[PDB]
Design a protein around this ligand. Structure first.
Ligand SMILES: [NH3+]C[C@H](O)c1ccc(O)c(O)c1
Length: 138
């Protein structure tokens, strides 16, 4: 698959450092994970073909303190957004307090990198959704 993960036990790898280790990402048997409380960073990588309709990456990450989001196209970082529960504000309209990232329609594929860290268990679910899913989030 293209929904891949990477465990950073040092927690020091950055976006450049992670893009220098693309061959260490490994396929996920499912679209979620959970890890007991540790100071490890969990990096998710998603390669998508060219998109034809407006869509969003949804991530329900309860108890997740820091979450950094990076988007890669033509070897460039087009978007770089840092948020998280430990991050303040970031208010958005989902009762769930879930996360959504718009996925562009620009005639090129894309690679997503997401870093998650916490002092609690690293529960997380994620998927790509269209408008049929967007209108039903809570
Ligand atoms: N849709 C995102 C939502 O506003 C939000 C904001 C900050 C958070 O720490 C979070 O989990 C969710």
């Amino acid at each position: 698959q293209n929904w891949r993960l990477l465990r950073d036990e040092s927690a020091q790898l950055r976006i450049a450092d992670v893009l220098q280790r693309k061959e260490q990402f490994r396929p996920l048997a499912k679209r979620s994970f959970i890890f007991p409380a540790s100071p490890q960073a969990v990096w998710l990588q998603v390669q998508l073909p060219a998109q034809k309709v407006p869509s969003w990456l949804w991530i329900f990450a309860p108890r997740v303190q820091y979450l950094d989001y990076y988007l890669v196209q033509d070897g460039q970082l087009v978007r770089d957004q840092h948020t998280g529960e430990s991050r303040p504000f970031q208010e958005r309209p989902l009762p769930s307090r879930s996360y959504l990232f718009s996925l562009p329609v620009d005639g090129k594929p894309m690679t997503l990198y997401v870093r998650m860290t916490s002092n609690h268990p690293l529960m997380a679910w994620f998927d790509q959704i269209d408008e049929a899913g967007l209108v039903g989030l809570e």
